[PDB]
Amino acid sequence: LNYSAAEEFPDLSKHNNHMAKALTLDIYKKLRDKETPSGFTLDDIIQTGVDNPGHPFIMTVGCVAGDEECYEVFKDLFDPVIEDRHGGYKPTDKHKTDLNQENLKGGDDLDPNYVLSSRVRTGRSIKGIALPPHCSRGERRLVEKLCIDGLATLTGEFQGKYYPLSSMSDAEQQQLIDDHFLFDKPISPLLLASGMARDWPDGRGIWHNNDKTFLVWVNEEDHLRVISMQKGGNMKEVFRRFCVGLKKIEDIFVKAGRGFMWNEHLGYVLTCPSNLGTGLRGGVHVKIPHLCKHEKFSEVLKRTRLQKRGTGGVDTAAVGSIYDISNADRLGFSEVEQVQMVVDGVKLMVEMEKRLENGKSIDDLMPAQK
Amino acid sequence: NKWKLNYSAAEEFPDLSKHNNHMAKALTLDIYKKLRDKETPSGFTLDDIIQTGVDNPGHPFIMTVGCVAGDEECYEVFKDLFDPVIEDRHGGYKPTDKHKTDLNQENLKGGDDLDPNYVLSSRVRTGRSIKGIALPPHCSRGERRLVEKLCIDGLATLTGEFQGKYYPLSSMSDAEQQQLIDDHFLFDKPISPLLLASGMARDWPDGRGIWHNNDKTFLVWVNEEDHLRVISMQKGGNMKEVFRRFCVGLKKIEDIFVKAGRGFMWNEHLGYVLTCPSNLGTGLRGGVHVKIPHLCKHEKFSEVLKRTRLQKRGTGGVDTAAVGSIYDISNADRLGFSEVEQVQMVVDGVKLMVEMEKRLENGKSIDDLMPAQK
Numbered sequence: 001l002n003y004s005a006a007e008e009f010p011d012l013s014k015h016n017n018h019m020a021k022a023l024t025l026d027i028y029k030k031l032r033d034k035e036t037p038s039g040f041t042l043d044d045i046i047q048t049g050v051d052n053p054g055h056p057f058i059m060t061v062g063c064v065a066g067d068e069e070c071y072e073v074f075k076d077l078f079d080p081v082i083e084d085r086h087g088g089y090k091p092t093d094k095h096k097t098d099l100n101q102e103n104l105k106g107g108d109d110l111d112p113n114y115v116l117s118s119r120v121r122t123g124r125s126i127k128g129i130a131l132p133p134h135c136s137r138g139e140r141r142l143v144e145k146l147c148i149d150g151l152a153t154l155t156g157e158f159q160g161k162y163y164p165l166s167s168m169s170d171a172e173q174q175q176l177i178d179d180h181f182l183f184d185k186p187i188s189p190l191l192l193a194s195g196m197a198r199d200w201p202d203g204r205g206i207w208h209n210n211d212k213t214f215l216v217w218v219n220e221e222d223h224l225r226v227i228s229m230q231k232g233g234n235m236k237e238v239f240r241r242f243c244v245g246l247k248k249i250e251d252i253f254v255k256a257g258r259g260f261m262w263n264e265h266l267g268y269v270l271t272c273p274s275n276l277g278t279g280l281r282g283g284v285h286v287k288i289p290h291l292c293k294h295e296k297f298s299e300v301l302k303r304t305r306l307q308k309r310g311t312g313g314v315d316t317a318a319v320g321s322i323y324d325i326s327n328a329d330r331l332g333f334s335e336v337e338q339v340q341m342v343v344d345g346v347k348l349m350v351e352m353e354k355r356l357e358n359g360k361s362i363d364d365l366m367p368a369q370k
Numbered sequence: 371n372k373w374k375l376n377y378s379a380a381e382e383f384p385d386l387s388k389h390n391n392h393m394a395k396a397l398t399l400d401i402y403k404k405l406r407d408k409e410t411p412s413g414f415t416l417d418d419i420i421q422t423g424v425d426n427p428g429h430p431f432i433m434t435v436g437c438v439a440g441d442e443e444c445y446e447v448f449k450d451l452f453d454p455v456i457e458d459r460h461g462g463y464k465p466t467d468k469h470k471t472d473l474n475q476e477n478l479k480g481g482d483d484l485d486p487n488y489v490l491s492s493r494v495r496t497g498r499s500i501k502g503i504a505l506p507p508h509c510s511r512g513e514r515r516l517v518e519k520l521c522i523d524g525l526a527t528l529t530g531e532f533q534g535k536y537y538p539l540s541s542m543s544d545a546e547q548q549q550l551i552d553d554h555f556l557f558d559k560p561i562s563p564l565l566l567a568s569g570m571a572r573d574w575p576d577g578r579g580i581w582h583n584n585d586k587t588f589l590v591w592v593n594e595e596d597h598l599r600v601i602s603m604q605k606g607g608n609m610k611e612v613f614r615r616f617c618v619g620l621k622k623i624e625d626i627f628v629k630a631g632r633g634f635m636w637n638e639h640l641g642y643v644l645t646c647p648s649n650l651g652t653g654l655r656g657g658v659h660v661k662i663p664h665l666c667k668h669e670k671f672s673e674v675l676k677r678t679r680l681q682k683r684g685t686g687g688v689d690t691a692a693v694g695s696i697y698d699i700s701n702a703d704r705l706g707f708s709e710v711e712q713v714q715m716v717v718d719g720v721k722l723m724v725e726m727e728k729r730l731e732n733g734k735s736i737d738d739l740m741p742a743q744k
C-alpha cells in the first residue's frame with residue numbers, strides 16, 4: 001500500500017461492464033483498505049471485471065462476492081451495480097420470496113410437440129462459509145460433506161446418491177453433460193478470473209435422485225445449485241418437485257446449524273450479483289424455427305420478460321431450431337412470479353410458432369409489456 | 371490464514387493423488403502443517419505458492435514445477451517447500467550450494483557454426499526481478515506500473531545497436547500483436563495454464579509491453595511471467611553472435627538499473643530470483659529452432675535430451691506442439707552452471723543432434739553418438 005489510490009486504480013477506459021460503470025476513484029479510495037471477515041477485498045471483488053472488459057453490446061456484471069459480508073462492507077460498489085443490473089433496484093427495496101408451488105396457475109399443459117423439456121434451477125450459499133471465488137479447500141469440503149450427509153436422508157422420490165467428480169470417468173462425465181444433467185469444468189474467462197475454478201475437481205460433484213428429476217450441483221458456481229427437470233411440458237410438476245425438494249433440503253441444513261444466506265434486501269445471497277433475489281432460472285427447450293427468425297421475436301422476449309439462449313438439441317449441442325427460453329428477472333419478482341412468466345410467455349410463443357407455420361400473422365397475439 | 375485456521379491442516383491439504391509436478395512430489399502434510407500459517411512481508415502464503423500445482427496436475431508437453439514465488443522472501447520463508455522442489459527440478463542443486471555467474475562471452479568456445487540447414491534460429495533469454503517489488507503472481511497494479519516506468523526510463527537510455535523503442539500492449543492493435551507473436555518476438559496471449567492459475571494474468575494488458583531495437587535482435591519483455599525478460603535472437607545458427615549481444619546488452623541494462631538505485635533480486639544460493647523455481651540461478655534459457663524430422667521420432671530422442679540436459683518445446687513455445695518437425699531445444703537446468711556453461715551445453719548438444727539427424731537420414735545408427743549423462 002506504498003502506492004496511492006490513483007496509482008492502483010484500474011484502467012477501465014475500454015470496459016463495458018456494470019462494475020466499471022459504477023466504480024470511481026472516491027469509492028476505490030474509501031474501500032481499497034477494507035476486508036471482510038474472510039479477508040476478501042475490493043481488488044478481489046472487481047478483478048474479474050478488470051480482466052474481462054466485456055463488449056459494448058452485452059453488459060457483464062464485472063464483480064463477485066467472496067463471502068456474505070461483501071454485500072455490506074462494499075455496498076458503495078454493489079448498490080449502484082445492483083441497481084443498474086437489476087433495473088433500478090434500490091438499496092431500500094425489499095425482495096419477496098415465494099416458494100409455495102400452489103401459487104402457480106396452470107403450467108402443466110405446455111405443448112409437448114414444441115416443448116421438449118422443462119427445467120427450474122436456483123443456487124444457494126451456506127451461512128458461515130466463504131463463496132466459491134474465495135472458499136478454501138477445507139470450506140469447499142465442508143459444503144460437500146454437508147450435502148453428502150444431508151442429502152443422504154432424503155427419501156421417496158427424493159431418494160438419491162452423490163457422485164464426486166473424482167468418481168466418474170471422463171467418459172461418464174461427458175455423457176452426463178451431454179444429457180444436460182451435469183456441469184462441465186468452467187472455461188468462461190469471467191468465471192476463471194474470479195478464482196472459482198481453484199482446486200478443481202476437488203470438492204465438486206453431483207447428487208441426484210434415481211430418476212434424475214431432482215439434482216444438486218455441489219460447489220460449482222455456488223455452494224449449491226438445485227435443479228428440477230423433465231422431458232415434456234408439465235412445468236407445474238417440475239416446479240412442484242422443485243419447491244418440495246428445496247424445502248426438504250433447507251430443513252435438513254437448518255437442522256444441521258447451517259442455513260442458506262438470505263436477507264430481506266437481496267433475497268438469497270449468491271456469488272454473482274446478477275443472480276440475487278431468487279437464484280432462479282426456469283425454462284424450457286422449445287422448437288421455434290419460424291418465430292426465432294421473426295422480426296418481432298426480439299420484441300416478444302422483451303415484453304414477456306423472457307430470455308433466450310442456446311442448447312440446440314435436447315441432446316445435441318448447437319443444432320436445430322431448439323432454443324432455451326427462460327425468465328429474465330432475478331430479484332424484484334418472486335419464484336412463483338418468475339415461473340409464471342415462463343409458463344405464460346412460453347405458452348404464447350408456441351401459439352405464435354403455430355400461426356407462423358400457417359403463414360398467418362402474429363400481430364393478433366403480440367403481448368403487452370410486463 | 372486466520373480464517374483457514376478454523377480448519378485443520380488435513381482439511382486444507384490438497385488432494386495431489388493424481389498429480390505429476392515437482393510441487394506434488396515434495397509437498398507433505400507435515401510441511402503443509404508447518405508452513406500454512408506463515409506469510410511474507412507482502413502477504414504471500416503457502417496456498418498462494420502451490421495453487422498452480424494443485425490446479426495443473428500435468429502439462430501436455432513438459433514436466434512442470436507446480437509452484438511460484440510471489441516475492442523475494444518466499445524462497446526463504448517457504449524454504450521447506452522450495453528446497454526439495456529446486457533439487458528435483460535442477461537435477462541435484464543443494465540448498466547449501468552457491469551460484470556463480472559468468473556473462474563473459476569470450477569464454478564461450480565456438481557456436482558460430484550451427485548447421486543453418488537444420489538450425490533455423492538461435493535465441494538466448496533470461497529474466498530479472500526488481501528489488502522491493504512483488505513478483506508477477508502477486509504484484510499490484512501500482513507495482514506493475516512502477517516496473518513498466520522503470521523499464522521505459524531505464525531502457526530509453528540505451529543507444530546504437532541497442533537503441534530502441536517501447537511498445538505497450540495497449541498501443542498495439544490485435545493484428546500488430548499477433549504479428550509480433552507469429553514472428554516469435556512477443557510473448558503470447560495470456561493463455562499459459564501457469565500464467566493463468568498463478569494469478570499472473572491479472573489486469574492484462576495493463577502494464578505489459580515489449581521493448582526492442584529496430585532490428586528486433588535484442589528485446590525486453592516487460593511484466594509477463596517476470597518483471598523483465600531480456601532476449602537476444604536472430605534467424606540462423608550463429609549462437610555465438612546471439613550470446614555476445616546477450617551479455618553486452620544485459621550488462622548494460624543491469625548497470626543502468628543499479629545506477630538508478632534499482633538493482634535486481636539476487637542471492638548467493640539461488641542466484642537470480644524469478645517467479646518460477648525452474649528459472650532461478652542464471653534464469654537463462656538458451657536454445658535454437660531445429661529441424662529434426664528423424665530424431666524426433668526416434669525411440670531414443672527423450673534419452674538424448676536427458677543425457678544432454680536439454681528440454682524440447684513446441685515451435686510456438688512451451689505451450690505448443692512442434693510444427694513441421696521444428697523443435698525448440700534449450701538448456702533445461704539453470705542452477706548449477708553459469709551462463710557460459712549452459713550456453714556451451716546447448717551448443718555441444720545441438721551439434722550432436724545435427725550429427726544425429728544426419729546419421730538417421732542415411733539410415734545409420736546413432737548409438738555410438740549417445741554421450742554419457744552430463
Ligand SMILES: Nc1ncnc2c1ncn2[C@@H]1O[C@H](COP(=O)(O)OP(=O)(O)O)[C@@H](O)[C@H]1O
Nearest residue numbers: 117118119121177180181281283284285311324
Ligand atoms: N430447459 C432445459 N432442459 C434441459 N436441459 C437444460 C434446460 N435448460 C438448461 N439445460 C442444460 O443445463 C446445462 C447448463 O446450461 P446453462 O445455460 O449454463 O444453464 P444454468 O446456468 O441454468 O445452470 C446445459 O447442459 C443445458 O443444456
Ligand SMILES: Nc1ncnc2c1ncn2[C@@H]1O[C@H](COP(=O)(O)OP(=O)(O)O)[C@@H](O)[C@H]1O
Nearest residue numbers: 491492493554655657658659685686687688698
Ligand atoms: N530458438 C528460438 N528462436 C526463435 N524464437 C524462439 C526460440 N525459442 C523460443 N522462441 C519463441 O519465444 C517465445 C516464447 O516461448 P516459451 O517457451 O514461452 O519461452 P520462454 O521460456 O522464453 O518464455 C515463443 O514465441 C517461441 O516460439
Ligand SMILES: CN(CC(=O)O)C(N)N
Nearest residue numbers: 433434435564646648688
Ligand atoms: C513452463 N514453465 C515451467 C514450469 O511450469 O515448470 C514456465 N513458464 N515457468
Ligand SMILES: [Mg+2]
Nearest residue numbers: 183184221225
Ligand atoms: Mg450453468
Ligand SMILES: [Mg+2]
Nearest residue numbers: 557595687688
Ligand atoms: Mg514463456
